[PDB]
Design a protein around this ligand. Structure first.
Ligand SMILES: CCCCCCCC/C=C\CCCCCCCC(=O)O[C@H](COC(=O)CCCCCCCCCCCCCCC)COP(=O)(O)OCCN
Ligand SMILES: Nc1ncnc2c1ncn2[C@@H]1O[C@H](COP(=O)(O)OP(=O)(O)OP(O)(O)=S)[C@@H](O)[C@H]1O
Ligand SMILES: Nc1ncnc2c1ncn2[C@@H]1O[C@H](COP(=O)(O)OP(=O)(O)OP(O)(O)=S)[C@@H](O)[C@H]1O
Lengths: 248, 334, 639, 334, 248
């Protein structure tokens, strides 16, 4: 059961004298309930790929099919309304509005639907107690630590149970303990409620929590690893071994 | 830009100035109205009119300038966002024509794909009965008739295989595969495939290979060697072909020799040209000259160069200079 | 490269972003030049008023300078706010602040002096329309002409060169406060103290309004407690306004927001979450704006009332059409009028100054004395002269209203007018009312209403001949006129008579009041319009800066997917709630300030107040619309 | 559309109103200018401005409406000639986009036509070696092997002829020829062509032609008859195939009958479907099954009706109805 | 000849209620002419350390002694001239002026030091020919590619002859070939004029061009590796062996 499907997508920046090509013929096949990671260096088109896969940017060529709907024909407003309802986003950086509390920040996407009052106050607590922020419900974002804001952002992204969740280096601003805690909670949330997460990283430690790793280099995918029955340590060692060949 | 705006909105300017001209003229023939006190009104009106025109020009001459920029140069998305209805009922037509062009291009692509699929099906349908015919006629009891039929069948098979390679040159890039291959089995298989021609021409085969292991794709290298052998057989009559492989330093090479008529030095570099043929001999009109070109092109992605040393009255020598072992490792990193 | 070339390229590239700055400078320069060129204009001396006319313009200019200085200082933020990463990069390269200051101040000078040059030309063009308006207001039929008045040019150059020093001072601090970390890249729960301040502000405002409304009802009829009440009202109103714009908006905002259990939508997020936290940071500016606007409107209304109340007070001040203090001068005037062929009906009406008792008629308060309760220099007239008001024995009719006396002194419904003579008494009763004063203000001082008694009663009164307070001229010598046919020639001959101008006239004094109060109203209206436009433009400038720190907030949520049409719908409500609170507060302040205008000097007008309350709303709506357009433009270019 | 015009030009009307207001105000303030004449001037200018607005709408709101009509239509001549530079830019942009679309379509059509020509050529030099092989091999003396080889060669030649006629059916319209055709020689040649199939399968033939003259195109009629007989022979085993031609009414009708297995009535109408292969036998899947479709399609321009009367277990009757000779006059006239 | 000497530096962001420490007792000794790098996953406090060491931000505790002079006992003006004379900076994003051409954009720092035109022209020509962007002088920065922009930005920092270069991750916006070329040219420029280039990276193949590598974990250095005679292929493998341990 494929959820996302791309066929030979391309993308370029600039014009005339500074027209550079970033993506060159990429094929992607993500399934339902999978937790996939694309790993590459800092010059590879990871953010560009995540932008064009979620309809934030526009491809020069190719075709993208999310959940059976062709997204190369919607103009702008259909794409925005599709993003508003069916997708979730987590970013490495500022996600929370400074003038709202935690509750009013992670109850924002539910305002489109008008899901009563108790039908929203129950779904808020059900996801808040799963991340340990239920005692931080009436605190402004300038009164909480670094990892608590990221957990709050993840709770906001998971509340309306979208089809695909796009994460761009979620643990790029946390120390070791906070990063490990957030990654473990993300994995548990994935396993409990079946959700497809596509994450782009440049850290093998954060990529060892996944189930399939795709190695990108200059807009071309050429390696795939599958976890299988191995635990986290063996998968981490295998990822380290694979990363050593593409760099030497 | 200024002149276009001024010439387009000329009726409005004329209408605006007509009232001031009328006031100035009327002030003369009216004793109760003074000229000096109406020239002040005229001045105060003309100042505001100039300011209003300057304000309107910048706002109005933007969408059409963007369209002029979009005309032919580049930046197909140079159009701006329309605001007035007249600028919307133009973008409507522009978008309609663009979408029609895009769907026509998609239709052309689908037609090309359908043609490729149909011609692949035809290739399968015309490759089935060559094999059926060969299997049926692999029962014959006479000598000369069997030799003639086998020669004709081998010629047709070679032509169809060359055509198939000519068509598969598009996807040869994706079909490159590296695995350990022994030269002796493939050479013996090629000799078996070319038994009838060598039997008729009395052409022997010599296999003295110092190194029997090569680093290249099986199918494409087999095509190259088969084409070289067929060219040598055509160019050499009643002569034995020497096949030797030796290690030229760090590059493995395979050498083929013959005692044929050879190639004139004036056209040695031109044998690998597309569709090239030799005008020296009358019987060369039946050769399309496609095996050499296809083999050389297929050897390029494998980092293999074909060396030719042919002399008229001596024969034709072909060398496949296989690359260094350390060079087939960049497909995973770069 | 050469630094001058870098400055030139910076100017030529950034000139497209500085149009509001240049427009504001041009507008200010033009207004100041146009207003000041009347002071040195020789034609202004034709305004024959009590005051000179070139002396009030000086103080008005002193106020105008302060009005425009803050406008320019608030406008300079448009120029200075954008350049932060520029200074960060220049400090990264190695330059000190003493060179970045000069680099960024070498083009502000060019823009400022270009605007100064242009605004003088545009202020000279409209220098005749202003003079024509002023002449039309005070009704002068002379001819207006174009004039340069180089003294005004010198004064304007000096004033704006003085303001540029403040501009440089404010540039220096902003340049100083930036660092090298600017190249890359508060809100809290409401305590209990604010919960108290918010209620205190509303309480103070309401108490001030209630106390002021009782003043117009008739209470506090004594000078002593009037000033205490006035001072208390002013203090309470101003303190309540400050506490309203500090913690009384966050109070109600928090109360409303807490009703929703923490489940808002995009409109509420974009409106309430900003109004709660950003309005309190501007509390000393909104207070000044509202208070000054209310004061200006009230003063203008008072001036207009006094301007249109001139003919009545001219008629009251001089009882007759013309007044005299000598019999020979009046006879000479009559001799001059003999050839004028205008029938003079001069009547030296004899009125006896008989003191009466009006202490019991007063219905005020024992602390209200106004000197002797019943020993005024009151006068009584007979029935033969005023035959329309026929009065029987023991009755009287007062002839006069005297609004100032009416608001202080209250006459009894059935009071008795007892003539407190030397030995006899003549109690009288009140039947009718009149407003005609029988003598001019020279003889009646504060203004004694004429008393009409029975003809035989007046015969007894003037045969008594009480040796007490009595007019020096018992028979007032005031010549009257026939139907209004040739009054202008009559006044011309009158002026020809008394070269010393020792007498009075009706149409002569019907012009001094107009010529003074019209100029006062002109000055007040000019300053009020200038301030009214400037305050709204300042609010627009302030709003133009909240969308640039919110640019990231508009960039995000759009990746989440919200569409620009959903992001501007909340801005349309934010601008309403931003520009409508000062409007309502100022409107109520103006309404309560203008009620004191006709509490004392008249009864009611209602005519100009409504007309002035429309320009206020129109300007506020225009600036709100402009702010909405700017935020739409900012939002569009986020993603 | 008048509402759009008014909403497009509100600024100039506002400017005109402001000019009138300024004139009135300055006339009111100044004492040397009467306030009576200016009112009359204002009224006259208002009326003349209304008339001018009407004329301006009439002269302005044409090009955009014509463009809106043109964009949704099957014709391109609904656009008016340019009258102002602003419309000229739009016209030039539309012309450029249409020219780009036309040139792109033309180049892709030309490239695809050249590819098809290369395909057809390749068909020619695939079919020629079969003829050369037959010429070489027509010297055997044995019976069974010769019969099997003849059967295979006829099958391959029929497939190649079907491919050639499928390629030619695009231009069959311009290649139609009207001439007298003798049925007996054509049927004799067709029977002699399939002699090997009849010998191997033991299938008899009957020659009984009541009508001997028909009017059609010889090549395509012979093609249709040849594949009809081929299908009858291949789908029958040792069955008597009869050919009957009779003149009924004013139209000549020829019928082909075989006594083979036949076609099940469920799939009898489907035999004319393109690429139709019967599912009851796996041996018939390898058959192309296109010759019947080619015959049916090529019979339409020649006004020939290829009817079917097939009963399962009995056989299939193929009826060829030659059109009236007087009907060919329209073909000759055009 | 030690040129930089930190000693037990500390730093903590936040005020009163919410304060979080970043650096925890770090000692650093750096020699002159040494191409030093610091490796660690994002969030370990790298750019904070580079801000502290470059005398851009203030420390909570500790003293830094660069070339003998004390750093924690100077005023803003003294720090300003010290940084102008003795420091150079390269960051991830090129900081260029679009209104200036490449030549006059590099020559901006050198046009304010009261120097003759010929000397500045010779210095610019030398630097440009060393880097290889000489032919792109009169082309404005909107007509060239990303690699050329980054090379111009790097060459701006080598024209006033500084003593220490403080480089952030300079190849975080470039592809593989451009990154390799820039790193090679940096290592070449280090060998002619002894510039103590200090680079902060999180990239295993970027720090194999250096001479010593220092590992940071959460605000405290862990290990150190010396180059010796390895040929950038054994050194890279050694870096990967320690990176694996420090990671998982
Ligand atoms: C940007 C700031 C520029 C403001 C400069 C505007 C010029 C000075 C401003 C405001 C003056 C306010 C006048 C006070 C209220 C006027 C009411 C009044 O006086 O009552 C009567 C009406 O007064 C007038 O006639 C004056 C009519 C216009 C007065 C207001 C003009 C508004 C000017 C603002 C816009 C025009 C721009 C002027 C400067 C470019 C006086 O009696 P009369 O009509 O003259 O005699 C009747 C016999 N035919
Ligand atoms: N100005 C700041 N205010 C508050 N916290 C900060 C600030 N700068 C950094 N931090 C925090 O300090 C921690 C370490 O961040 P950095 O100092 O940037 O380390 P770093 O990730 O190695 O540097 P970069 O930018 O990724 S090369 C993180 O938890 C940041 O959120
Ligand atoms: N707006 C842009 N204009 C021009 N070039 C761009 C733009 N955005 C990205 N690029 C180029 O695209 C390259 C790769 O895209 P990036 O988005 O930077 O990939 P990335 O760096 O791996 O993503 P992150 O942010 O590190 S997770 C960059 O090195 C730039 O050269």
């Amino acid at each position: 059961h494929v959820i996302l499907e791309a066929n030979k997508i391309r993308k370029s920046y600039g014009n005339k004298l500074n027209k550079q090509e970033v993506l060159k013929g990429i094929d992607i096949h993500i399934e339902k309930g999978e937790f996939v990671s694309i790993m590459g260096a800092s010059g590879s088109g990871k953010t560009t790929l995540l932008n064009v896969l979620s309809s934030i940017d526009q491809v020069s060529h190719g075709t993208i099919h999310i959940n059976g709907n062709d997204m190369t024909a919607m103009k702008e407003k259909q794409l925005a309304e599709f993003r508003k309802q069916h997708l979730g986003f987590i970013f490495q950086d500022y996600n929370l509005l400074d003038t709202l509390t935690v509750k009013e920040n992670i109850l924002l996407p539910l305002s489109i639907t008008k899901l009563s009052k108790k039908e929203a106050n129950r779904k808020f607590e059900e996801v808040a107690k799963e991340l340990g922020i239920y005692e931080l419900r009436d605190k402004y974002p300038n009164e909480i630590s670094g990892g608590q804001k990221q957990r709050t952002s993840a709770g906001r992204a998971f509340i309306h149970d979208p089809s695909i969740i796009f994460a761009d280096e979620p643990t790029g601003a946390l120390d070791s303990k906070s990063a490990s805690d957030l990654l473990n909670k993300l994995s548990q949330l994935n396993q409990k409620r079946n959700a497809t997460i596509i994450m782009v990283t440049h850290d093998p430690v954060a990529a060892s929590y996944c189930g399939r790793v795709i190695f990108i280099k200059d807009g071309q995918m050429y390696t795939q690893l599958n976890k299988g029955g191995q635990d986290r340590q063996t998968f981490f060692q295998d990822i380290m071994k694979t990363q050593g060949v593409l760099g030497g | 830009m200024i002149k276009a705006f001024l010439i387009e909105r000329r009726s409005w300017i004329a209408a605006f100035l007509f009232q001031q001209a009328l006031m100035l003229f009327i002030a003369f023939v009216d004793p109760s109205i003074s000229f000096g006190n109406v020239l002040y009104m005229v001045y105060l009106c003309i100042l505001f009119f100039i300011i209003f025109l300057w304000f309107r020009y910048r706002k109005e001459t933007a969408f059409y300038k963007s369209l002029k920029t979009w005309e032919n140069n580049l930046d197909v998305t140079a159009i701006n966002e329309p605001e007035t209805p007249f600028e919307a009922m133009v973008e409507r037509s522009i978008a309609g024509q663009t979408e029609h062009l895009k769907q026509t291009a998609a239709r052309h692509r689908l037609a090309l794909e359908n043609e490729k699929d149909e011609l692949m099906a035809w290739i399968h349908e015309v490759k089935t009965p060559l094999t059926a015919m060969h299997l049926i006629i692999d029962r014959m009891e006479e000598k000369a008739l069997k030799s003639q039929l086998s020669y004709e069948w081998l010629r047709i098979h070679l032509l169809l295989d060359q055509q198939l390679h000519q068509k598969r040159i598009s996807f040869i890039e994706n079909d490159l595969s590296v695995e350990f291959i022994q030269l002796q089995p493939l050479i013996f298989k090629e000799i078996k495939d070319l038994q009838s021609w060598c039997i008729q021409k009395g052409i022997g085969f010599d296999i003295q290979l110092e190194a029997k292991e090569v680093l290249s794709d099986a199918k494409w290298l087999a095509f190259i060697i088969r084409q070289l052998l067929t060219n040598a057989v055509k160019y050499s009559e009643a002569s034995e072909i020497e096949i030797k492989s030796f290690q030229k330093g760090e590059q493995t090479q395979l050498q083929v020799k013959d005692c044929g008529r050879g190639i004139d030095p004036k056209d040695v570099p031109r044998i690998f040209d597309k569709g090239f043929t030799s005008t020296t001999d009358h019987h060369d009109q039946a050769s399309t000259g496609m095996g050499l070109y296809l083999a050389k092109k297929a050897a390029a992605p494998l980092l293999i160069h074909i060396d030719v040393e042919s002399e008229f009255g001596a024969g034709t020598v072909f060398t496949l200079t296989f690359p260094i072992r350390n060079q087939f490792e960049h497909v995973i990193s770069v | 490269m050469n630094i001058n070339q870098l400055i030139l390229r910076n100017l030529k590239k950034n000139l497209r972003n500085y149009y509001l700055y240049v427009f504001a400078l041009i507008f200010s320069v033009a207004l100041y030049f146009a207003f000041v060129t009347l002071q040195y204009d020789p034609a202004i001396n034709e305004v024959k008023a009590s005051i000179k006319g070139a002396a009030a313009i000086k103080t008005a200019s002193i106020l105008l300078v302060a009005v425009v200085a803050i406008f320019i200082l608030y406008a300079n933020t448009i120029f200075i706010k954008r350049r932060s990463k520029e200074i960060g990069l220049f400090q990264l390269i190695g330059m000190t602040k003493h060179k970045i200051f000069r680099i960024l101040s070498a083009e502000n000078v060019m823009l400022y002096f270009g605007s100064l040059a242009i605004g003088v030309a545009a202020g000279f063009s409209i220098s005749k329309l202003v003079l024509m308006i002023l002449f039309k207001i005070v009704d002068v039929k002379a001819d207006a002409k174009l004039h340069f008045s180089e003294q005004a040019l010198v004064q304007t150059v000096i004033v704006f060169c003085g303001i540029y020093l403040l501009i440089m001072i404010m540039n220096y601090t902003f340049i100083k406060k930036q660092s090298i970390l600017s190249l890359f890249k508060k809100v809290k729960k409401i305590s209990f103290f604010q919960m108290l301040i918010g209620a205190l502000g509303i309480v103070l405002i309401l108490t001030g309004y209630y106390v002021s409304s009782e003043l117009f009802g008739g209470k506090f009829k004594t000078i002593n407690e009037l000033f205490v009440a006035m001072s208390f009202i002013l203090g309470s109103v101003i303190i309540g306004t400050f506490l309203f714009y500090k913690g009384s908006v966050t109070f109600i905002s928090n109360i409303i927001r807490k009703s929703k259990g923490g489940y808002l939508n995009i409109s509420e997020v974009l409106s309430l979450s900003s109004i709660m936290f950003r309005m309190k940071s501007n509390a000393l500016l909104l207070t000044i704006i509202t208070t000054v606007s209310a004061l200006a409107i009230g003063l203008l209304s008072l001036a207009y009332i006094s301007y249109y109340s001139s003919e009545k007070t001219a008629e009251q001040n001089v009882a007759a059409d013309f007044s005299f203090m000598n019999e020979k001068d009046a006879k000479l005037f009559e001799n001059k009028l003999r050839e004028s062929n205008i029938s003079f009906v001069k009547k030296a009406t004899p009125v006896l100054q008989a003191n009466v008792d009006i202490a019991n008629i007063m219905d005020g308060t024992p602390k209200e004395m106004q000197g002797d309760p019943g020993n005024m220099q009151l006068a009584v007239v007979s029935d033969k002269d005023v035959k329309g008001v026929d009065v029987a024995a023991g009755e009287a009719v007062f002839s006069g209203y005297t609004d100032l006396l009416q608001k202080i002194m209250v006459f009894k419904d059935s009071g008795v007018i007892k003539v407190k003579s030397k030995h006899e008494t003549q109690p009288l009763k009140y039947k009718g009312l009149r407003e005609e004063f029988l003598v001019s203000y020279t003889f009646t001082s504060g203004g004694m209403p004429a008393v009409i008694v029975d003809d035989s009663l007046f015969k007894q009164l003037d045969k008594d001949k009480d040796p007490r307070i009595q007019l020096a001229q018992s028979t007032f010598i005031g010549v009257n006129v026939k139907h209004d046919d040739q009054m202008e020639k009559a006044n011309e001959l009158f002026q020809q008579v008394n070269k010393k101008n020792e007498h009075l006239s009706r149409l002569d004094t019907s012009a001094a009041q107009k010529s003074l109060f019209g100029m006062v109203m002109f000055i007040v209206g000019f300053l009020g319009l200038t301030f009214l436009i400037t305050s709204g433009c300042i609010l627009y400038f302030k709003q133009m800066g909240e969308s640039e720190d919110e640019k990231p907030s508009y960039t995000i949520l759009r990746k989440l997917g919200f569409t620009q049409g959903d992001l501007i719908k909340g801005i349309r409500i934010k601008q309403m709630y931003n520009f409508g609170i000062p409007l309502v507060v100022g409107l109520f302040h103006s309404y309560f300030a203008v009620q004191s205008g006709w509490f004392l000097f008249g009864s009611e007008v209602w005519a100009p107040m409504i007309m002035v309350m429309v320009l206020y709303t129109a300007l506020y709506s225009i600036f709100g619309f402009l702010s909405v357009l700017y935020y739409k433009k900012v939002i569009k270019s986020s993603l």
